[PDB]
């Protein structure tokens, strides 16, 4: 009935100043702003959900316009709650500053 995930923003790729590695993304999870608070989210699955034009099949339902790129949280980043994430395919750059759902079912509690 309600919402079962947590908001994160796809801030950007793991990078230096002149090089960027697109195989690792940086997520800003809402509400967590320090390293001693990000150990909860380590290993949780994350999803980038977006609409498209063509219909695609969905598990346990009729086809619709929704598509998803899956991934998982790997490790903390920085000192301010930033999180490193790895997805099965590198996220498109058009998702910079957009919503990624981090879920809870890879649970350890």
């Amino acid at each position: 009935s309600g919402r079962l995930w947590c908001k994160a923003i796809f801030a950007g790729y793991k990078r230096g100043l002149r090089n960027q590695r697109e195989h690792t993304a940086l997520l800003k999870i809402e509400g967590v702003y320090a390293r001693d608070e990000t150990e909860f989210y380590l290993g949780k699955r994350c999803a980038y959900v977006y609409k498209a034009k063509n219909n695609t099949v969905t598990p346990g339902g009729k086809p619709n316009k929704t598509r998803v790129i899956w991934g998982k949280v790997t490790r903390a980043h920085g000192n301010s709650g930033m999180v490193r994430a790895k997805f099965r395919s590198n996220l498109p750059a058009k998702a910079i500053g957009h919503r990624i759902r981090v879920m809870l079912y890879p649970s350890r509690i």
Binding site: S1, G2, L4, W5, E37
Partner: protein
């Protein structure tokens, strides 16, 4: 011959015994345990008798074949894997299903099954979920428990019972088992005030609350 005795040393740590070699030589009493030095079947036929050879040669060898594999030791089939359970999960605990069709429904937990799946049920009279299996990873175990140490669940229910077959029709055996379990579960949860409504409700996340902050 000889009855198989148990191991003479308790496991101190995995792979290390409590007693040393000499202590074992003493405890086993080995000082007085010294020791010193198909493919054919004859059948009658109505002629005479024929020596039929079972395990006969194949009538077709393939163009080419793969070689054998090297031997490895630490790999075991899923049947005899050691089963682990989270410390926070004990019989009579409330869980929150996170991924099934019953998303975020508070459900009472009863028993760990043989293959590692949790046998779970919140009495479908109030939260509408039957006897079911659920993976222990995909559930949140809150710190609210009831006492179900004094309830009996049938021994016939198991993973073979819950295994999918093949439209799915519920069986009368399923109905009677669910009734038998819930007739004992329900009075226990009705003793605790405001617990039936809690189980009826559905967990959700609103803005301003974060799982890493909130405790359960």
């Amino acid at each position: 011959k000889g009855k198989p005795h148990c191991s003479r040393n308790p496991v101190l740590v995995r792979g290390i015994g409590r007693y040393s070699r000499s202590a074992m030589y003493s405890r086993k009493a080995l000082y007085k345990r010294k020791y010193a030095a198909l493919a054919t079947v004859t059948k009658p036929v109505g002629g005479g008798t024929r020596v039929v050879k079972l395990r006969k040669m194949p009538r077709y060898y393939p163009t080419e074949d793969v070689p054998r594999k090297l031997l490895s030791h630490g790999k075991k089939p899923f049947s005899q894997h050691v089963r682990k359970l989270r410390a926070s999960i004990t019989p009579g605990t409330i869980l929150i299903i996170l991924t099934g069709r019953h998303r975020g429904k508070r459900v009472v937990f009863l028993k760990q099954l043989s293959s590692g799946l949790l046998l779970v049920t919140g009495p479908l009279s109030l939260n509408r979920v039957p006897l079911r299996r659920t993976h222990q990873k995909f559930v949140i175990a809150t710190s609210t428990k009831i006492d179900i140490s004094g309830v009996k669940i049938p021994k016939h229910l198991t993973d073979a019972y819950f295994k999918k077959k093949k439209k799915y029709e519920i069986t009368e055996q399923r109905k009677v088992d669910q009734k038998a379990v819930d007739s004992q579960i329900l009075p226990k949860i009705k003793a605790v005030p405001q617990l039936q409504g809690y189980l009826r409700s559905v967990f959700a996340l609103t803005n301003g609350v974060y799982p890493h902050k909130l405790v359960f």
